[PDB]
Amino acid sequence: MNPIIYTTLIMTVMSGTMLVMISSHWLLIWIGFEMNLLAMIPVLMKNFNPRATEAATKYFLTQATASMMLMMAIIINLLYSGQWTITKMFNPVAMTMMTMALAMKLGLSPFHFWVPEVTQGISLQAGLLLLTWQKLAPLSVLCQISQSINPNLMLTMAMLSILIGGWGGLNQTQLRKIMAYSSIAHMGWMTAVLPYNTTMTILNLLIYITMTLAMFMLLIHSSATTTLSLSHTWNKMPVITSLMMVTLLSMGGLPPLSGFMPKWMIIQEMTKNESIIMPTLMAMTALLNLYFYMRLAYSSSLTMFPSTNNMKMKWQFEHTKQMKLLPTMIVLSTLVLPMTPALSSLN
Amino acid sequence: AKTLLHKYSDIPEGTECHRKAYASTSIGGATGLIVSAYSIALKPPASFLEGVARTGRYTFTSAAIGAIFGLTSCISAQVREKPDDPLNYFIGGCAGGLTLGARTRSYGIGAAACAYMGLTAALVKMGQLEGWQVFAEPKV
Amino acid sequence: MPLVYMNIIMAFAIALAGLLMYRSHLMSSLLCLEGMMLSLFIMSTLIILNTHFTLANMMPIILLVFAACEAALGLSLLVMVSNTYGTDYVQNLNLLQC
Amino acid sequence: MTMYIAFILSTIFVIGFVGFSSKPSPIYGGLGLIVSGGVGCGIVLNFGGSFLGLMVFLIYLGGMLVVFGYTTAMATEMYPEVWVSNKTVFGAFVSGLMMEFCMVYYALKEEEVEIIFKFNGLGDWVIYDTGDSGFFSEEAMGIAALYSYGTWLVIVTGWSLLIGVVVIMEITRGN
Amino acid sequence: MNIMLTLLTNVTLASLLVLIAFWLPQLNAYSEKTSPYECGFDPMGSARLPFSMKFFLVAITFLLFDLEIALLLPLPWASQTNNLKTMLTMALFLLILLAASLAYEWTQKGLEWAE
Amino acid sequence: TMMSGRPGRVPLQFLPNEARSLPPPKLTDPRLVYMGFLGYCSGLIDNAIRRRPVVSAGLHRQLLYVTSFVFFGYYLLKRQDYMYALRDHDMFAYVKSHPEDFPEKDKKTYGEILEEFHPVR
Amino acid sequence: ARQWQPDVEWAEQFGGAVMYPTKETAHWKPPPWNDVDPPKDTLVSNLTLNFGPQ
Amino acid sequence: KFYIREPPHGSPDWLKVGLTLGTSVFLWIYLIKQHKEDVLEYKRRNGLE
């Protein structure tokens, strides 16, 4: 792809997301989603192969169906109240349609199936984009209409997402599918607190994006897409594997790391309500994500796997292009828990 | 929907074990039917008759579990003259677990289902008595 | 609510189910997507015509424009799938199973 | 209940949707969607939206011509299926037909809720406006306001169209 | 009302013409007469086999160029607005981008058929 | 949710004019020192990733890291303090304007209240 | 004396298509090293036309 | 020794060092001035000094 065309497509994706965020009109939000999808499809197919075509097709079909449902919900809301402004969503049937449309755009269970397949079929850069930037617009829309959101449906989908992400991640050897399942579980954690406090949702979003950016940038630095290809990295880049292990621990949620803070705040916010059982189940289920993170850490940093002879030639060459902000993302992804009260600048 | 659960809950705890068992088996049948729908959607059976066989198997197992649970819990509540107690629900849950183990023809599944279903039913009864909310309304 | 509204909403639901159910050819699914656009256009136009909102008369035009954008996107993807496999069968799109 | 014309047109709309919803080959699915586009054009003509109905008919005619070309190129088989040549297609077709008839019967006979809320029928002529005003047409003025009021819509739409051309180029590039 | 009568009359006249054409003459159809027409011999394959489309890229662009017509047809009415300077800016903007999209596909060899 | 919509609020200000009536955080604030420590750690990780002497490779870029983190942290702390001050102001005003919902109860002494005694044995 | 470190037999249990191999997924194969599946040599079928004699 | 001379110079890249140190100094001076202005403004509003 031409660099100019690639830059234009990336800016069109970003402009669609910004249009979703800055619009007070339902039609303009729909147009932002459609522009985002239109520019997003080629980026997944930047490196051409049958798997990339499959991922692009599946992503397009899922997002197009979601756009259908979103427009239908908008039209029903217009029919029952001649309002075009993104607000309380005066009709409950339209609200259910909108909730399922946005959940299927996000990948929340039971609509989670598309995410592992699309993440595995594309490169690591497109996977980074898909799992970080493509979550902002649906979550922004969900935040704007959280007053009319139904707790029973949203909490059911969030708990389902946490359970399914934890379970599906256990079976995975490929790194992209592991990241997709962890993304699903984090999405569930984000949307569980949505009807109670959207500031906690935004905080979890920012922490998850920081950790995900760090992890994808580490996986791009060490060109590893499977468990055993990452098992070789210690023989060339031990510091990278150590940083990856600390980032994985942070992803798991163990204190005093940055990852612990979002769950800690969500649990506190839910227990400010009555809501005792559900946070308990959420933590006991996040234990599964911690387990397969630890499996990755065992394979990559805490043990030394056998290497090959040709690594001696790689020993003589440096990493050509260094991605900026990798150091910053690692630090923000690990050592930020003492700055927890600064979340008050988010509401 | 939840009208099944209202028809189950509108019956007093220690009265009319037949009606309570009917409501419980209706709930079980609905759950098994939903499970069958998802299983057929995700794992096709390669033929229509094998699919209806799987649907009937799952639905019958769930309905039997629910019926046994409701009947045993109601009978235990009324013979012991002790309603508002989670022990009746525990006994019903273990009876349902034994039913599941017999349906799957396995002693280990039967014992595990006894323990876990009894614990779950006891917790549900405790939540009914105390007022625990699975899906709390936002209040703050 | 009138009865024509029932008919339009039933048309939308039928097209959504038709899209959800997949037979073999991808082309038929794109047909169902375009039918869903058609139903949404008709519903929007009827509501917009009935209550005299003058400024929303343009949004069905924009809806059709972005419908065409989706149609072109789907056709390009179908071209590439057929080039890879020689048929537009969805059964072939199973590489990401493993 | 006055000549039932809007009712008949909407019923044919649903019938065409059932026809192409069945997925009994692209050539016949295109025919069904063309019929649906025509009857929808008529439906919105009956409400005063002549420009919108004609334009959607034109757009869908062009789209269905492109789809016919693509069906003969890449979505064809030895024996294309019609609505009676396969048990699944025929079953879906008759199921859609009977569902439409059932909801029509349970709507005309009783005012019982189907999904959103129960309706009345009574003929869609009752809900009209008695509007006696204007030497212009409201719909044409509203659509023409896309250039005076809808600058933002024009900008986003034109950008989307240019980007879509670039996108189809990149996707079908190949390599 | 009158357009319905006109359409019904035209369709009925055409249908009666077909009916006359099929029921007036003497039909004698046998298997050889109704066989598919190749010039002299029997076809090798089927007419239902895939037929490659060398202008597939122009066909997709036709969909996007067709919807640029839906945006320009209300222009005769838009010329009657009071603020003509913002209308003329928007109408020319909508055609420059249409011209630039045609130029882009032209320069990138998108208008050439597949060889 | 709770603070998203409030009267007289500029959308993207990040620091309203009424925030200047609050004491600014001291430059030796422990949170600012922690932000500077985060900048130093980022600089060290930058040195280690690029295969450079971790402690001594780039002093100018490490200084830039530290000062950038401190600079962002100062305004972050200002906004944090402003939002907490708004929370307390609103809560106090709401308590004052709704006396019947926050009534001062009668003061009882431990000689009058009867607490049940549970022996340990 | 020296600490135990994983060998080939240990490392090959993380080299399959999935963890926990089963009966259904035993015949799955891991994706290609570069995510490029071999091109399916699809037989091209041109249209054969009788041009003439009539 | 190096076969090729490692494009990152054997001397410091004085341009990058220059603007890096310059932006660090500018940021520190701006922060000091902002802090002083905030202190004076706060004392002015609250009637302290």
Ligand SMILES: CCCCCCCCCCCCCCCCCC(=O)OC[C@H](COP(=O)([O-])OCC(O)COP(=O)([O-])OC[C@@H](COC(=O)CCCCCCCCCCCCCCCCC)OC(=O)CCCCCCCCCCCCCCCCC)OC(=O)CCCCCCCCCCCCCCCCC
């Ligand atoms: C506004 C929002 C709302 C929007 C949504 C609104 C939707 C409603 C409007 C829809 C109108 C329909 C118009 C067109 C639809 C398009 C159909 C289509 O394209 O077909 C493609 C699709 C693909 O076929 P194909 O690839 O060309 O042929 C290859 C073979 O099909 C496959 O190859 P094979 O033979 O090797 O495979 C083995 C065999 C295997 O065959 C089987 O295994 C099926 C046997 C299942 C037994 C059913 C349970 C029996 C007992 C239940 C009793 C109920 C309660 C009674 C008391 C309890 C009793 C104990 O075939 C299958 O795998 C088929 C399984 C899928 C069945 C159909 C899926 C529908 C939903 C899932 C139902 C699952 C049933 C479980 C129970 C559900 C709860 C009752 O065709 C089919 O799947 C076959 C059936 C299609 C004909 C009927 C379609 C109508 C269904 C519409 C929705 C259902 C009703 C909704 C009403 C809601 C109230 C208003």
Ligand SMILES: CCCCCCCCCCCCCCCCCC(=O)OC[C@H](COP(=O)([O-])OCC(O)COP(=O)([O-])OC[C@@H](COC(=O)CCCCCCCCCCCCCCCCC)OC(=O)CCCCCCCCCCCCCCCCC)OC(=O)CCCCCCCCCCCCCCCCC
């Ligand atoms: C924290 C500190 C440490 C704690 C941890 C350690 C302790 C706890 C863990 C250890 C024990 C728990 C293990 C659970 C059971 C495991 C079964 C299993 O794994 O299945 C796979 C395993 C093999 O799998 P498979 O291929 O499906 O079966 C092929 C067989 O190998 C082929 O077998 P077969 O063909 O030769 O014959 C099979 C058949 C024929 O049976 C036999 O072959 C032999 C008979 C075995 C059981 C029948 C009872 C006869 C002896 C009992 C006499 C009185 C005992 C003392 C009680 C009064 C105290 C004064 O079995 C039956 O029909 C028996 C039905 C069950 C009736 C027993 C009812 C006992 C309820 C408890 C009442 C007392 C509670 C204590 C209250 C005390 C208050 C002061 O199944 C078995 O072989 C075991 C079946 C027999 C069940 C034994 C369980 C009774 C022990 C008490 C359990 C209560 C503890 C937990 C409470 C909650 C449980 C509901």
Ligand SMILES: CCCCCCCCCCCCCCCCCC(=O)OC[C@H](COP(=O)([O-])OCC(O)COP(=O)([O-])OC[C@@H](COC(=O)CCCCCCCCCCCCCCCCC)OC(=O)CCCCCCCCCCCCCCCCC)OC(=O)CCCCCCCCCCCCCCCCC
């Ligand atoms: C709570 C209180 C404070 C605690 C805060 C947290 C800890 C401190 C901050 C952490 C971040 C800071 C540094 C991070 C980047 C450094 C990376 C590194 O490798 O360092 C190498 C570097 C030595 O390398 P070199 O000299 O360039 O040449 C040797 C080659 O480079 C040799 O290169 P190589 O290729 O041969 O290296 C291979 C090696 C290299 O692998 C590593 O070195 C591991 C890298 C550390 C991961 C850091 C991730 C982010 C930090 C998270 C910390 C988590 C804390 C929470 C608790 C959970 C613990 C995980 O990998 C392995 O051999 C595999 C071993 C697998 C073990 C798995 C465990 C690793 C994770 C443990 C992290 C725990 C914190 C460690 C902090 C210090 C570590 C250097 O270490 C240093 O010299 C820096 C140490 C600190 C300098 C401070 C000195 C300033 C002046 C002193 C005076 C103080 C004030 C004076 C005023 C008083 C008035 C008079």
Ligand SMILES: CCCCCCCCCCCCCCCCC[C@@H](O)O[C@H](CO[C@H](O)CCCCCCCCCCCCCCC)COP(=O)(O)OCC[N+](C)(C)C
């Ligand atoms: C501020 C920083 C912006 C940075 C981001 C730039 C990205 C967007 C591009 C520029 C922003 C577009 C804003 C335009 C909003 C339209 C409304 C405003 O501009 O007024 C209009 C002014 O009209 C002008 O024509 C505005 C458009 C001029 C710009 C031409 C389009 C070029 C934009 C670049 C992006 C397009 C993509 C393709 C590149 C060529 C109408 O004024 P008026 O008619 O009195 O009042 C109408 C109301 N009535 C009916 C009551 C009278």
Ligand SMILES: CCCCCCCCCCCCCCCCC[C@@H](O)O[C@H](CO[C@H](O)CCCCCCCCCCCCCCC)COP(=O)(O)OCC[N+](C)(C)C
């Ligand atoms: C690991 C931590 C991740 C942090 C993520 C990146 C850190 C740097 C953030 C970049 C700073 C620039 C962003 C904005 C600066 C100027 C723009 C200004 O207008 O923003 C206003 C206010 O600024 C931002 O809103 C707040 C950004 C502050 C981010 C830091 C908080 C991190 C959470 C706590 C973790 C501790 C981090 C410690 C430092 C590393 C917006 O006000 P408003 O229009 O009304 O908000 C609308 C949306 N709401 C109401 C729903 C919130």
